């Protein structure tokens, strides 16, 4: 499967060769609670854990199914 990520210059996107092809959408509070905004990290996992600790996480298993919310309809 395909997958997005947040790491290089712009948004990164690669395919997950192993069994872990799930695209998670992690998001917590980084300045939106303070001043700037909520944090967002796009990645590829196999055992998408629970975001209960103190954040969010959308576990999906489709080609680059981890797109951005505020960033997309530019």
């Amino acid at each position: 499967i395909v997958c997005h990520t947040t790491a290089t210059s712009p948004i990164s996107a690669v395919t997950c060769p192993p069994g872990e092809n799930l695209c998670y959408r992690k998001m917590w509070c980084d300045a939106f609670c303070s001043s700037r905004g909520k944090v967002v990290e796009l990645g590829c996992a196999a055992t998408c854990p629970s975001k209960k600790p103190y954040e969010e996480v959308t576990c999906c298993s489709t080609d680059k199914c981890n797109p951005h919310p505020k960033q997309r309809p530019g």
Binding site: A7, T8, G37, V39, K70
Partner: peptide
């Protein structure tokens, strides 16, 4: 010329205020 690895920080709220991280010695 340099180019590092992969480091980002995308904040929900604003698209014109992206936090990019590539290289900075």
């Amino acid at each position: 010329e340099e180019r590092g690895w992969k480091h980002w920080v995308y904040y929900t709220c604003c698209p014109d205020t992206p936090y990019l991280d590539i290289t900075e010695e």
